[PDB]
Amino acid sequence: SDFDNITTADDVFKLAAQRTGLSEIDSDSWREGLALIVDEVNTSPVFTPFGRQRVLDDATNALGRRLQVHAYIQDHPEVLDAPVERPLIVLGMPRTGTTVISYLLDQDPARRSLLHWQCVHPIPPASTETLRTDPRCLALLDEQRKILDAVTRAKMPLPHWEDADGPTEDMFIHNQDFKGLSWDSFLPTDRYARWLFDEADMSSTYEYQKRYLQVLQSTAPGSWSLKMPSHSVHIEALLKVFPDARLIWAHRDPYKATGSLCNLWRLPQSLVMNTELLDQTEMGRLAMWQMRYHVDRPLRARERIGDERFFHMYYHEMMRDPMDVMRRIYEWADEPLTAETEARMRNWLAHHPQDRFALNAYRLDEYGLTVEALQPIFAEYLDTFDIELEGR
Ligand SMILES: CCCCCCCCCCCCCCCC(=O)O
Numbered sequence: 567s568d569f570d571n572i573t574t575a576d577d578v579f580k581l582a583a584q585r586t587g588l589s590e591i592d593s594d595s596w597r598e599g600l601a602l603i604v605d606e607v608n609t610s611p612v613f614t615p616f617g618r619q620r621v622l623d624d625a626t627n628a629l630g631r632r633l634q635v636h637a638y639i640q641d642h643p644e645v646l647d648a649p650v651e652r653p654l655i656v657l658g659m660p661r662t663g664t665t666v667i668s669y670l671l672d673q674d675p676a677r678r679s680l681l682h683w684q685c686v687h688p689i690p691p692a693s694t695e696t697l698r699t700d701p702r703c704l705a706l707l708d709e710q711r712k713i714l715d716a717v718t719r720a721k722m723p724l725p726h727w728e729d730a731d732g733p734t735e736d737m738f739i740h741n742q743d744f745k746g747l748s749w750d751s752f753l754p755t756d757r758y759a760r761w762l763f764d765e766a767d768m769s770s771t772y773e774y775q776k777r778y779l780q781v782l783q784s785t786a787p788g789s790w791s792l793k794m795p796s797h798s799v800h801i802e803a804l805l806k807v808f809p810d811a812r813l814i815w816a817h818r819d820p821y822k823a824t825g826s827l828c829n830l831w832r833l834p835q836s837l838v839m840n841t842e843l844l845d846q847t848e849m850g851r852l853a854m855w856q857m858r859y860h861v862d863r864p865l866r867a868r869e870r871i872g873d874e875r876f877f878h879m880y881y882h883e884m885m886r887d888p889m890d891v892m893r894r895i896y897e898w899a900d901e902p903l904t905a906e907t908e909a910r911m912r913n914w915l916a917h918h919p920q921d922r923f924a925l926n927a928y929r930l931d932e933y934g935l936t937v938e939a940l941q942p943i944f945a946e947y948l949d950t951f952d953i954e955l956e957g958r
Pocket of ligand 1: 659660735737747748749750751752759794795796797827830856
C-alpha cells in the first residue's frame with residue numbers, strides 16, 4: 567500500500583481493490599475526475615512529498631468506499647426499490663453558518679441525517695438504534711481522542727463529528743465519484759474546479775448519492791435531511807435525481823462568506839502544499855469565481871421553478887432565534903413538530919451556545935479583494951434576498 571508506483575487513476579483503483587478485497591464497480595464515472603487529481607499531484611511542484619501521498623491516500627480510501635457500496639448493492643438489489651422521498655436539502659454558499667440547523671433537524675427521531683462515520687465506513691449499514699453507538703463510530707471517536715497529542719500544538723480545526731456521530735455534508739459521498747468541490751481545496755490550481763463546474767456531468771454523482779442513501783435507509787429508515795453548499799452549483803443535476811426535494815436555501819452576508827471561504831482554504835493548503843509557492847491574492851479571485859456559481863446557479867433554477875420550492879434560512883435569523891426558524895421550516899415542509907422533538911431541539915441549543923451576531927470588517931485585503939469588486943457578483947443576490955450584512 568505505497569504511493570511510489572501510483573502514476574494513474576487505474577493504479578489508485580488497484581490499491582483500493584487490494585485494500586477492500588473487491589474489484590467490481592458500477593461504472594466508469596469515477597475515472598475522469600480522479601485522473602485530473604492524480605495528474606496534478608504527480609506534476610505540480612507545489613505539493614509536499616507528504617502532501618502528495620496524503621491526497622492519493624484519501625483518493626484511495628474514497629474509491630474504496632465506492633467499491634464497498636457496489637459490492638453491497640449487488641448482494642442487496644432490493645435497497646434500490648425503496649424510494650428516497652422529499653429529502654430536506656440545505657444548499658447555498660459555503661460559510662453561511664448552517665451548522666445549527668443540521669443538528670436541530672437531527673433531533674427529530676423520524677428524520678435521518680448523513681453521519682460522518684457513514685462517509686468513512688458505510689458498509690454494512692447500521693440499525694437506527696445504533697447510528698451513534700456502532701463500533702465503527704466509536705472507533706472513529708476513539709482514534710480521534712487518540713490524536714490529542716498535547717505536543718504544545720493547538721490542533722487542526724476539523725475534528726469532524728462533534729457529539730457521538732454528527733451530520734456531515736454529501737460532499738463526502740460525492741468525492742467518492744471524484745466530482746466534489748472538496749478535492750479542489752487540496753489542489754494548487756483551479757483546473758479541477760473549472761472542470762467540475764463547467765464540464766463534469768453531475769448525474770453519475772447524484773445517482774450515486776441516491777443509491778448510497780438507499781443503502782443507509784435499508785437498516786435505518788426515515789426522511790432524509792441533507793446538506794452541502796455546492797448543491798446550489800449542481801442544483802440542476804440534483805433536481806433531476808431528487809425532483810421532489812424540499813430545498814432550504816441558506817443565506818448570509820456574501821462578502822463575509824467569501825473572505826471566510828479563502829480563509830477556510832488555508833488549512834488544507836498547509837497540510838499538503840508548500841505554502842510559500844501560493845499567492846493568497848490570487849486565491850481571492852478563485853473564491854470570487856466559485857461564489858458566483860453558488861448564487862447564480864440556484865438563482866436561475868429559482869426563476870424557473872418558483873420561490874415556493876425553497877425555504878430561506880438567514881444567518882441573522884438563525885442567531886437571534888433558531889427555534890422560530892425551525893417551526894417555520896416545519897410549517898413550510900408541512901410536517902408536525904412534536905413536543906418531544908421541540909424539547910430535544912431546545913436541549914441541544916441550551917448545551918451549544920452560538921456566537922452572537924456581530925459586525926466586523928470583512929477585509930478581503932488578505933486575499934486581494936474589496937467589497938467594491940464583489941458587489942457585481944452578488945448584486946442580484948442581495949437584491950432578491952433581504953440579507954442583514956455584517957460589514958464595516
Ligand atoms: C461549496 C461547498 C459545497 C460542499 C460542502 C462540503 C465541503 C466542500 C468544500 C468546502 C469549501 C467550498 C469552496 C471550494 C473549496 C475547494 O475549492 O475545494
